[PDB]
Amino acid sequence: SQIRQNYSTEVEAAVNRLVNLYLRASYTYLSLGFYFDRDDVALEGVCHFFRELAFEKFEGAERLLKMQNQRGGRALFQDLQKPSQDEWGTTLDAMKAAIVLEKSLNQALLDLHALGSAQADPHLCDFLESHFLDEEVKLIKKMGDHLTNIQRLVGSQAGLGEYLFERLTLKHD
Amino acid sequence: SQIRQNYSTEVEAAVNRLVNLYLRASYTYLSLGFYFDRDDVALEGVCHFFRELAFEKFEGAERLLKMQNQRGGRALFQDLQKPSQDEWGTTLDAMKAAIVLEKSLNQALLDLHALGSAQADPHLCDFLESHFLDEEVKLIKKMGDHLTNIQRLVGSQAGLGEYLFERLTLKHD
Amino acid sequence: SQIRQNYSTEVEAAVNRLVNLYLRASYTYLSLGFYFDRDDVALEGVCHFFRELAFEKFEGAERLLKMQNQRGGRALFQDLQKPSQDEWGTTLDAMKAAIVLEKSLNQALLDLHALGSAQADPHLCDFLESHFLDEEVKLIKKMGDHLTNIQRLVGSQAGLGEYLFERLTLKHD
Amino acid sequence: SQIRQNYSTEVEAAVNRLVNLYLRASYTYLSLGFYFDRDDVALEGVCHFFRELAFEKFEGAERLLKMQNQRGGRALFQDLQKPSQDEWGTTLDAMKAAIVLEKSLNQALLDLHALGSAQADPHLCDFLESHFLDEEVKLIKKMGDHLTNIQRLVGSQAGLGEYLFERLTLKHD
Ligand SMILES: CCN(CC)c1ccc2nc3c4ccccc4c(=O)cc-3oc2c1
Ligand SMILES: CCN(CC)c1ccc2nc3c4ccccc4c(=O)cc-3oc2c1
Ligand SMILES: [Cl-]
Ligand SMILES: [Cl-]
Ligand SMILES: [Cl-]
Ligand SMILES: [Cl-]
């Protein structure tokens, strides 16, 4: 490359792997969103929440791909694995699956940051810190807040609580 | 002092003591507010309510300190004791603790008013009447209204009631 | 915690310690500000400077507490020690005390950054770099600029210089 | 009187006496203001400060006279004694004379409040608290702040300090 400088093959490959993880996450959120749009589930605020996350994760992949090119690396795409489930259960089940997904992306970000630090690649480290690490922390905090409210609402009237959460916390429309 | 007039040492000291009580109250409300922002509590309206009170109590201390100087007294600061609890329980537990705190501040205001009356210090008495006594009465009334609504919502579904109170009465986002 | 990830007990505790240091600093600045509002000191620009810093340091504590919760740590509050002095001397004495205070906060920030680096906690490191380290450097530079101007103005006419500094450099109004 | 109620002859007379004191104070401030407008004194900000106070004290008398009539008492005017001096010295001398004057008015307000309290006349007490006591405290605090700044500026260059105070603290432009 005529521009590549201080950009290791290891980081280049890990970036491509992370693009795959973000596109898989986007796909998972597309599946979650449309599940909640089913006539027999019908929780608009939950659908909207997950569809928004599908877009956010795509944007994350886009930013990684832009940076790969800015650095002189080469984007390499792999097959995208389908989401882990076809049906996602209750809002609680779905929000738990989402927090599990987000922690896995966060760990991948942290692992890439550590590789960048080890390789003395401060542009990579700053890129992740400036556009991914705090965004992930903020999202996981939101999802934990949601889990706690969903859990408080289960009690002995689960359907009532699931409706009220979707109507009074989640944005709808 | 070149300006001090009709301002007793007893009032000056009690004013400094009251500044301590208001800053302690502000600190208590800072702790309450952040407790409700925990991911495992997650009641935004309750957090906002108490954080607002932390500011209001600081403002109270500020006004007392401004008046101390207007009168020619000397501000004296003491250590500020940490709040009485690290974890604040339910919204009900917290609102009960807040009403207890406010009654204690109110009693301190009333005690200072009585000292001012005894010392024939009408500026002090007017100051408390104009900026503190009715503010306290209004706040205690609001908190009692809240307690009654929180208590009516406990029934056999406590989590549901705690969510609904935070969503439909407390300001959030 | 359902959200805690890559957040050490050591960082959590140091964050709580730093909240204490920032609230102590806020309290010190509240005392400095009201000292300069005394009728026998009467330097409005100096009062305003320090009162503004009391708010800035509170805001710093607030940001730390928000982050503690975003990360899944638990805020723990301790007693707040009263400021080191009841009377703060001249503007020069006060500005020297403030630079000493700020260097101590800066060192605490640097120590926490180093702990975060050692623990491979890049979110913490970025948080401090983005919201605290440059703010501290900018403030210490301002205070040094002030010290130099205050010192140049002492000469053989200290009262004249103290008045002129407050009137022509410090904001009043 | 067809309207007089709970309004003692003692309060009525003391109100008339206080009108005299306020008009005497207004006259003193008129003399101070024009002294500072002399071509051989020439301190516009000091002149403006005292002329403003002449108006403020007249307004005070006007308010007392309005209240006397609201209560059913009868305004009675006495001779107004000329100010204590024809020439007022330095800005420092003048500001000291003004603080002495204001403390004397404040004491008269406090004495009237105490009479009203003794006579169970809460309208009178509220009137003084709402329109006079805090206004007096605020003005005496301002004058003390001014005295301190004037005194700090004397040093070994009195004319320089007197000019700088008038230019940088007092309103002119
Ligand atoms: C002295 C230590 N303590 C008591 C815990 C302070 C000090 C300063 C504070 N300043 C603010 C403040 C300042 C500007 C704008 C809003 C606020 C606010 O909402 C709450 C505050 O709370 C404070 C507590
Ligand atoms: C009764 C004799 N005395 C005392 C010396 C008065 C009478 C009337 C006065 N009327 C004004 C006045 C009227 C309108 C607008 C502004 C002003 C003012 O700035 C000061 C005054 O001062 C007064 C003193
Ligand atoms: Cl698969
Ligand atoms: Cl304690
Ligand atoms: Cl101490
Ligand atoms: Cl005479």
Side-chain angles (χ1 to χ4, degrees), chain D residues 113-136:
Chain D
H113 191 284
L115 173 60
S117 184
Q119 295 263 7
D121 191 340
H123 184 272
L124 175 76
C125 289
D126 164 84
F127 168 86
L128 291 176
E129 286 161 13
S130 297
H131 301 301
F132 287 82
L133 299 187
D134 186 52
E135 297 303 300
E136 193 56 36

PDB file of all heavy atoms in Angstrom, chain D residues 113-136:
ATOM      1  N   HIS D 113     -39.853  48.456  64.495  1.00  0.00           N
ATOM      2  CA  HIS D 113     -40.327  47.056  64.427  1.00  0.00           C
ATOM      3  C   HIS D 113     -40.616  46.533  65.840  1.00  0.00           C
ATOM      4  O   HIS D 113     -41.594  45.868  66.038  1.00  0.00           O
ATOM      5  CB  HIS D 113     -39.289  46.204  63.674  1.00  0.00           C
ATOM      6  CG  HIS D 113     -39.804  44.854  63.323  1.00  0.00           C
ATOM      7  ND1 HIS D 113     -39.928  43.852  64.256  1.00  0.00           N
ATOM      8  CD2 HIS D 113     -40.261  44.352  62.161  1.00  0.00           C
ATOM      9  CE1 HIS D 113     -40.418  42.781  63.678  1.00  0.00           C
ATOM     10  NE2 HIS D 113     -40.631  43.061  62.400  1.00  0.00           N
ATOM     11  N   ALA D 114     -39.713  46.831  66.747  1.00  0.00           N
ATOM     12  CA  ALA D 114     -39.897  46.317  68.113  1.00  0.00           C
ATOM     13  C   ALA D 114     -41.154  46.930  68.743  1.00  0.00           C
ATOM     14  O   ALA D 114     -41.811  46.241  69.497  1.00  0.00           O
ATOM     15  CB  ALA D 114     -38.651  46.634  68.907  1.00  0.00           C
ATOM     16  N   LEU D 115     -41.413  48.200  68.468  1.00  0.00           N
ATOM     17  CA  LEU D 115     -42.635  48.846  68.995  1.00  0.00           C
ATOM     18  C   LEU D 115     -43.862  48.153  68.387  1.00  0.00           C
ATOM     19  O   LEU D 115     -44.792  47.835  69.096  1.00  0.00           O
ATOM     20  CB  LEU D 115     -42.571  50.335  68.625  1.00  0.00           C
ATOM     21  CG  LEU D 115     -43.820  51.155  68.939  1.00  0.00           C
ATOM     22  CD1 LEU D 115     -44.135  51.122  70.423  1.00  0.00           C
ATOM     23  CD2 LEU D 115     -43.659  52.588  68.464  1.00  0.00           C
ATOM     24  N   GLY D 116     -43.796  47.918  67.087  1.00  0.00           N
ATOM     25  CA  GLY D 116     -44.928  47.236  66.444  1.00  0.00           C
ATOM     26  C   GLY D 116     -45.180  45.852  67.012  1.00  0.00           C
ATOM     27  O   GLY D 116     -46.327  45.462  67.165  1.00  0.00           O
ATOM     28  N   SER D 117     -44.094  45.125  67.234  1.00  0.00           N
ATOM     29  CA  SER D 117     -44.214  43.787  67.867  1.00  0.00           C
ATOM     30  C   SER D 117     -44.864  43.876  69.280  1.00  0.00           C
ATOM     31  O   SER D 117     -45.814  43.165  69.712  1.00  0.00           O
ATOM     32  CB  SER D 117     -42.863  43.135  67.934  1.00  0.00           C
ATOM     33  OG  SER D 117     -42.969  41.824  68.462  1.00  0.00           O
ATOM     34  N   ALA D 118     -44.349  44.844  70.019  1.00  0.00           N
ATOM     35  CA  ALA D 118     -44.876  45.053  71.394  1.00  0.00           C
ATOM     36  C   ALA D 118     -46.368  45.406  71.345  1.00  0.00           C
ATOM     37  O   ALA D 118     -47.111  45.039  72.257  1.00  0.00           O
ATOM     38  CB  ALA D 118     -44.116  46.138  72.093  1.00  0.00           C
ATOM     39  N   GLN D 119     -46.771  46.149  70.320  1.00  0.00           N
ATOM     40  CA  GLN D 119     -48.185  46.607  70.189  1.00  0.00           C
ATOM     41  C   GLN D 119     -49.034  45.593  69.405  1.00  0.00           C
ATOM     42  O   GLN D 119     -50.165  45.917  69.105  1.00  0.00           O
ATOM     43  CB  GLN D 119     -48.216  47.956  69.495  1.00  0.00           C
ATOM     44  CG  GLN D 119     -47.550  49.074  70.283  1.00  0.00           C
ATOM     45  CD  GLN D 119     -48.547  49.881  71.072  1.00  0.00           C
ATOM     46  OE1 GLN D 119     -49.723  49.547  71.153  1.00  0.00           O
ATOM     47  NE2 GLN D 119     -48.078  50.960  71.660  1.00  0.00           N
ATOM     48  N   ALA D 120     -48.464  44.462  69.037  1.00  0.00           N
ATOM     49  CA  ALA D 120     -49.162  43.432  68.233  1.00  0.00           C
ATOM     50  C   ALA D 120     -49.721  44.076  66.965  1.00  0.00           C
ATOM     51  O   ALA D 120     -50.902  43.929  66.712  1.00  0.00           O
ATOM     52  CB  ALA D 120     -50.235  42.733  69.037  1.00  0.00           C
ATOM     53  N   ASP D 121     -48.838  44.719  66.202  1.00  0.00           N
ATOM     54  CA  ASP D 121     -49.209  45.385  64.927  1.00  0.00           C
ATOM     55  C   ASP D 121     -48.461  44.662  63.812  1.00  0.00           C
ATOM     56  O   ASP D 121     -47.446  45.124  63.375  1.00  0.00           O
ATOM     57  CB  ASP D 121     -48.817  46.862  64.977  1.00  0.00           C
ATOM     58  CG  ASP D 121     -49.395  47.686  63.845  1.00  0.00           C
ATOM     59  OD1 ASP D 121     -49.779  47.088  62.830  1.00  0.00           O
ATOM     60  OD2 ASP D 121     -49.441  48.908  63.996  1.00  0.00           O
ATOM     61  N   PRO D 122     -48.967  43.505  63.359  1.00  0.00           N
ATOM     62  CA  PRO D 122     -48.224  42.734  62.372  1.00  0.00           C
ATOM     63  C   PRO D 122     -48.178  43.363  60.972  1.00  0.00           C
ATOM     64  O   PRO D 122     -47.288  43.085  60.258  1.00  0.00           O
ATOM     65  CB  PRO D 122     -48.969  41.385  62.345  1.00  0.00           C
ATOM     66  CG  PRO D 122     -50.371  41.721  62.771  1.00  0.00           C
ATOM     67  CD  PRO D 122     -50.201  42.822  63.791  1.00  0.00           C
ATOM     68  N   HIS D 123     -49.150  44.218  60.674  1.00  0.00           N
ATOM     69  CA  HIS D 123     -49.072  44.897  59.359  1.00  0.00           C
ATOM     70  C   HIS D 123     -47.830  45.797  59.329  1.00  0.00           C
ATOM     71  O   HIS D 123     -47.130  45.804  58.350  1.00  0.00           O
ATOM     72  CB  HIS D 123     -50.335  45.710  59.074  1.00  0.00           C
ATOM     73  CG  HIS D 123     -50.308  46.311  57.713  1.00  0.00           C
ATOM     74  ND1 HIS D 123     -49.744  47.541  57.466  1.00  0.00           N
ATOM     75  CD2 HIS D 123     -50.738  45.842  56.525  1.00  0.00           C
ATOM     76  CE1 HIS D 123     -49.844  47.811  56.184  1.00  0.00           C
ATOM     77  NE2 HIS D 123     -50.449  46.787  55.586  1.00  0.00           N
ATOM     78  N   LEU D 124     -47.637  46.519  60.417  1.00  0.00           N
ATOM     79  CA  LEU D 124     -46.457  47.421  60.471  1.00  0.00           C
ATOM     80  C   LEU D 124     -45.128  46.630  60.366  1.00  0.00           C
ATOM     81  O   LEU D 124     -44.148  46.916  59.664  1.00  0.00           O
ATOM     82  CB  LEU D 124     -46.504  48.224  61.775  1.00  0.00           C
ATOM     83  CG  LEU D 124     -45.278  49.101  62.021  1.00  0.00           C
ATOM     84  CD1 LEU D 124     -45.321  50.341  61.146  1.00  0.00           C
ATOM     85  CD2 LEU D 124     -45.152  49.481  63.484  1.00  0.00           C
ATOM     86  N   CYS D 125     -45.129  45.554  61.138  1.00  0.00           N
ATOM     87  CA  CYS D 125     -43.905  44.718  61.166  1.00  0.00           C
ATOM     88  C   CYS D 125     -43.615  44.153  59.774  1.00  0.00           C
ATOM     89  O   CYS D 125     -42.485  44.213  59.337  1.00  0.00           O
ATOM     90  CB  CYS D 125     -44.076  43.601  62.186  1.00  0.00           C
ATOM     91  SG  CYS D 125     -44.034  44.204  63.903  1.00  0.00           S
ATOM     92  N   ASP D 126     -44.637  43.630  59.117  1.00  0.00           N
ATOM     93  CA  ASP D 126     -44.468  43.078  57.750  1.00  0.00           C
ATOM     94  C   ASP D 126     -44.046  44.182  56.774  1.00  0.00           C
ATOM     95  O   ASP D 126     -43.244  43.934  55.912  1.00  0.00           O
ATOM     96  CB  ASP D 126     -45.763  42.394  57.310  1.00  0.00           C
ATOM     97  CG  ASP D 126     -45.838  42.138  55.809  1.00  0.00           C
ATOM     98  OD1 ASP D 126     -45.308  41.121  55.378  1.00  0.00           O
ATOM     99  OD2 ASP D 126     -46.430  42.965  55.092  1.00  0.00           O
ATOM    100  N   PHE D 127     -44.659  45.338  56.917  1.00  0.00           N
ATOM    101  CA  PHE D 127     -44.329  46.475  56.028  1.00  0.00           C
ATOM    102  C   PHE D 127     -42.823  46.779  56.103  1.00  0.00           C
ATOM    103  O   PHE D 127     -42.184  46.970  55.091  1.00  0.00           O
ATOM    104  CB  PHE D 127     -45.176  47.686  56.439  1.00  0.00           C
ATOM    105  CG  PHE D 127     -44.759  48.993  55.815  1.00  0.00           C
ATOM    106  CD1 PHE D 127     -45.234  49.367  54.571  1.00  0.00           C
ATOM    107  CD2 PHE D 127     -43.885  49.841  56.469  1.00  0.00           C
ATOM    108  CE1 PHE D 127     -44.849  50.567  53.995  1.00  0.00           C
ATOM    109  CE2 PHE D 127     -43.507  51.044  55.895  1.00  0.00           C
ATOM    110  CZ  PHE D 127     -43.992  51.406  54.664  1.00  0.00           C
ATOM    111  N   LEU D 128     -42.307  46.836  57.322  1.00  0.00           N
ATOM    112  CA  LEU D 128     -40.882  47.182  57.499  1.00  0.00           C
ATOM    113  C   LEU D 128     -40.021  46.029  56.979  1.00  0.00           C
ATOM    114  O   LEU D 128     -39.015  46.267  56.347  1.00  0.00           O
ATOM    115  CB  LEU D 128     -40.636  47.440  58.989  1.00  0.00           C
ATOM    116  CG  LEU D 128     -41.279  48.691  59.573  1.00  0.00           C
ATOM    117  CD1 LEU D 128     -41.033  48.746  61.073  1.00  0.00           C
ATOM    118  CD2 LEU D 128     -40.743  49.945  58.900  1.00  0.00           C
ATOM    119  N   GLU D 129     -40.455  44.818  57.256  1.00  0.00           N
ATOM    120  CA  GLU D 129     -39.636  43.664  56.849  1.00  0.00           C
ATOM    121  C   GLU D 129     -39.615  43.593  55.329  1.00  0.00           C
ATOM    122  O   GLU D 129     -38.547  43.359  54.756  1.00  0.00           O
ATOM    123  CB  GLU D 129     -40.269  42.384  57.386  1.00  0.00           C
ATOM    124  CG  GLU D 129     -40.086  42.182  58.875  1.00  0.00           C
ATOM    125  CD  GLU D 129     -41.067  41.194  59.483  1.00  0.00           C
ATOM    126  OE1 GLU D 129     -41.738  40.480  58.717  1.00  0.00           O
ATOM    127  OE2 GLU D 129     -41.162  41.149  60.703  1.00  0.00           O
ATOM    128  N   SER D 130     -40.762  43.828  54.697  1.00  0.00           N
ATOM    129  CA  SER D 130     -40.894  43.660  53.229  1.00  0.00           C
ATOM    130  C   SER D 130     -40.284  44.799  52.402  1.00  0.00           C
ATOM    131  O   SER D 130     -39.883  44.548  51.279  1.00  0.00           O
ATOM    132  CB  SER D 130     -42.349  43.475  52.876  1.00  0.00           C
ATOM    133  OG  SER D 130     -42.833  42.290  53.485  1.00  0.00           O
ATOM    134  N   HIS D 131     -40.264  46.009  52.932  1.00  0.00           N
ATOM    135  CA  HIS D 131     -39.805  47.156  52.117  1.00  0.00           C
ATOM    136  C   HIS D 131     -38.585  47.905  52.685  1.00  0.00           C
ATOM    137  O   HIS D 131     -38.073  48.776  51.993  1.00  0.00           O
ATOM    138  CB  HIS D 131     -40.973  48.132  51.953  1.00  0.00           C
ATOM    139  CG  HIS D 131     -42.140  47.504  51.297  1.00  0.00           C
ATOM    140  ND1 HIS D 131     -42.046  46.957  50.038  1.00  0.00           N
ATOM    141  CD2 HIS D 131     -43.393  47.316  51.700  1.00  0.00           C
ATOM    142  CE1 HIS D 131     -43.223  46.455  49.702  1.00  0.00           C
ATOM    143  NE2 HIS D 131     -44.052  46.662  50.696  1.00  0.00           N
ATOM    144  N   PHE D 132     -38.155  47.603  53.912  1.00  0.00           N
ATOM    145  CA  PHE D 132     -37.059  48.416  54.501  1.00  0.00           C
ATOM    146  C   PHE D 132     -35.889  47.613  55.084  1.00  0.00           C
ATOM    147  O   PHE D 132     -34.771  47.957  54.821  1.00  0.00           O
ATOM    148  CB  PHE D 132     -37.623  49.297  55.625  1.00  0.00           C
ATOM    149  CG  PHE D 132     -38.453  50.437  55.096  1.00  0.00           C
ATOM    150  CD1 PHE D 132     -39.779  50.251  54.748  1.00  0.00           C
ATOM    151  CD2 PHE D 132     -37.883  51.680  54.884  1.00  0.00           C
ATOM    152  CE1 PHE D 132     -40.522  51.295  54.223  1.00  0.00           C
ATOM    153  CE2 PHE D 132     -38.631  52.725  54.376  1.00  0.00           C
ATOM    154  CZ  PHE D 132     -39.944  52.527  54.038  1.00  0.00           C
ATOM    155  N   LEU D 133     -36.189  46.567  55.843  1.00  0.00           N
ATOM    156  CA  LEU D 133     -35.086  45.900  56.604  1.00  0.00           C
ATOM    157  C   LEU D 133     -34.035  45.272  55.673  1.00  0.00           C
ATOM    158  O   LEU D 133     -32.863  45.420  55.957  1.00  0.00           O
ATOM    159  CB  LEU D 133     -35.673  44.874  57.586  1.00  0.00           C
ATOM    160  CG  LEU D 133     -36.617  45.392  58.666  1.00  0.00           C
ATOM    161  CD1 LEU D 133     -36.959  44.266  59.625  1.00  0.00           C
ATOM    162  CD2 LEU D 133     -36.000  46.550  59.422  1.00  0.00           C
ATOM    163  N   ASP D 134     -34.479  44.512  54.679  1.00  0.00           N
ATOM    164  CA  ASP D 134     -33.470  43.873  53.802  1.00  0.00           C
ATOM    165  C   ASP D 134     -32.830  44.915  52.869  1.00  0.00           C
ATOM    166  O   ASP D 134     -31.670  44.805  52.571  1.00  0.00           O
ATOM    167  CB  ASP D 134     -34.070  42.701  53.014  1.00  0.00           C
ATOM    168  CG  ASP D 134     -33.020  41.940  52.233  1.00  0.00           C
ATOM    169  OD1 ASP D 134     -32.022  41.551  52.839  1.00  0.00           O
ATOM    170  OD2 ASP D 134     -33.209  41.780  51.028  1.00  0.00           O
ATOM    171  N   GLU D 135     -33.616  45.896  52.452  1.00  0.00           N
ATOM    172  CA  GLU D 135     -33.016  46.970  51.633  1.00  0.00           C
ATOM    173  C   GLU D 135     -31.882  47.639  52.420  1.00  0.00           C
ATOM    174  O   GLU D 135     -30.864  47.900  51.814  1.00  0.00           O
ATOM    175  CB  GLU D 135     -34.099  47.973  51.226  1.00  0.00           C
ATOM    176  CG  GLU D 135     -35.179  47.360  50.349  1.00  0.00           C
ATOM    177  CD  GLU D 135     -34.660  46.716  49.077  1.00  0.00           C
ATOM    178  OE1 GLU D 135     -34.039  47.426  48.267  1.00  0.00           O
ATOM    179  OE2 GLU D 135     -34.873  45.507  48.902  1.00  0.00           O
ATOM    180  N   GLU D 136     -32.104  47.868  53.693  1.00  0.00           N
ATOM    181  CA  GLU D 136     -31.068  48.528  54.492  1.00  0.00           C
ATOM    182  C   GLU D 136     -29.874  47.577  54.612  1.00  0.00           C
ATOM    183  O   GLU D 136     -28.747  48.020  54.512  1.00  0.00           O
ATOM    184  CB  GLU D 136     -31.701  48.936  55.829  1.00  0.00           C
ATOM    185  CG  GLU D 136     -30.881  49.897  56.638  1.00  0.00           C
ATOM    186  CD  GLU D 136     -30.546  51.150  55.861  1.00  0.00           C
ATOM    187  OE1 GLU D 136     -31.393  51.614  55.077  1.00  0.00           O
ATOM    188  OE2 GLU D 136     -29.440  51.621  56.033  1.00  0.00           O
TER     189      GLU D 136
END
